[model samples]
Target chain A: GFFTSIGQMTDLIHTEKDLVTSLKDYIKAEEDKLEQIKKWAEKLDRLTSTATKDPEGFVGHPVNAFKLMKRLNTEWSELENLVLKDMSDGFISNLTIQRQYFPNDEDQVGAAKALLRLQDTYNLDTDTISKGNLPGVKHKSFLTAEDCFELGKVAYTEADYYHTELWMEQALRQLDEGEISTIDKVSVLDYLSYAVYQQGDLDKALLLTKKLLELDPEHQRANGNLKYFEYIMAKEK
Target chain B: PPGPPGPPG
Candidate 1:
């Protein structure tokens, strides 16, 4: 039911030229509306501030400040709902078009990335974008190292060790070829260690844990795991 | 010993 009506617009976008123009116009209109909403929000803030400063001044006014505030709140809510709807529709439209015309993983990732940007800008729930039920990008090769690492983190949170390990391995390969911040490296290493460990690769886990400690000697989880892994090693010996 | 406190899943 997501974008139930607007999605039908695909029928109108038979050509790439039509899709591009429509997308441009749609995005431009939404951006302009957002600017208007932002200005209205600023005006409301000033009105509220002024009303609070002289409550009596607002008392005799035909349009009371409280009523104005209430009206603005309702309008703002409605406008925000429309923005969400438009953004969702835009994302679904783009995704559906991309899947139909260009089913490559790169194109799909590009479409998904744009949707993520829109979601972030609007403070919309991330789940909304993923819940579109579009085909997921099939390979980690099409995504950047950071993206793979992020995917790994998501799987890690879900306790999907298999996927976590899969993505983390891809991330590690990219880390080897690129220069990343130590903090980011540490995070990936931590997750990778746990992932491999969960999959019964204790030695690799311990090595990664040590790698993490070398970066930050006091990493709490790494420290704890170091002790635990050492204990396990002794038990095995 | 059980495992590196499995990633905070």
Candidate 2:
């Protein structure tokens, strides 16, 4: 019995394309019903207006009240269809309208909105980084972090240990406390360890690299850092 | 409209 019932439902939906097309047709039918309800409302308005102007002649008039009741009946029927049956269609329409207005590529839009939330929470000045507009309208949120990390890398490559340490410290702090998820923590730790290594703080670099390894034992950079630091220590010995 | 993609997930 269960298999036969499921087979019937499958046939129905397969012929119906997962019921999407059927649902769309139903929504159109509901719209037509709404149009009929609107006409009834107009008629009711006229009847109410006439009755208000002549209470003794029209008030509690059986024929007029009967017509009014018919219109109210139509309204209740339309309300159920509009609110319940057509709600899914309305939701899709609203989403389409929103996509047309906002229109940002997915990742950047998400990052910008999240960064804005963080900035708002801290009462930070958006004008300093953002254009004070919606996310993706002004600037990509994570671009700030990217630039800071790149600048720190450049300082390290140029052998500016002090600047490398300073910029990397800031970058690491932001990455740790920013919206980066736990899965990305290891990558940030590797970057921080590299910066410290370039700053001639081998001991601190070793500790950070060990922490990175704890998160991801097979991380190439962490393994390389440990081996290289050991070689340097051996050379000093 | 679409409530801004549910505040970016």
lDDT of each: 0.68, 0.58
Error of 2 at A187 (Å): 3.3
Q: Could you give the CAPRI-style class of model 1? A: acceptable
Which one wins on TM-score? 1
Local lDDT at A95 for model 2: 48
After TM-score superposition, the amount by which residue A30's alpha carbon in candidate 2 deviates from its true location, in angstroms, is 24
Model 2 Cα shift for residue A64 (angstroms) = 40
Candidate 2: how large is its RMSD?
A: 19.5
TM-score of chain A, cand. 2? 0.35
DockQ of each: 0.44, 0.02
Residue A1 C-alpha lDDT in model 2? 70
Model 1 Cα displacement at A32 (Å)?
Answer: 17
Q: What is the two-chain DockQ of model 2? A: 0.02
- Where does candidate 1 clash, by residue pair? none
State what share of the real interface contacts each candidate retains. Answer: 0.45, 0.00
Error of 1 at A107 (Å): 17
Give the per-residue lDDT digits (tens) of candidate 1, residues A1-237.
Answer: 447434544543555566676678778877887887788779878977988898887867867855867776887787667656554477457757666654465534544445445645666443333334234444323456676676676666657676677666667676777746332777788888888888888899889989989988999889988889888878887
lDDT per residue for candidate 2 within A77-122, as digits (tens), equals 7655654644366546644544443424553434434454565566
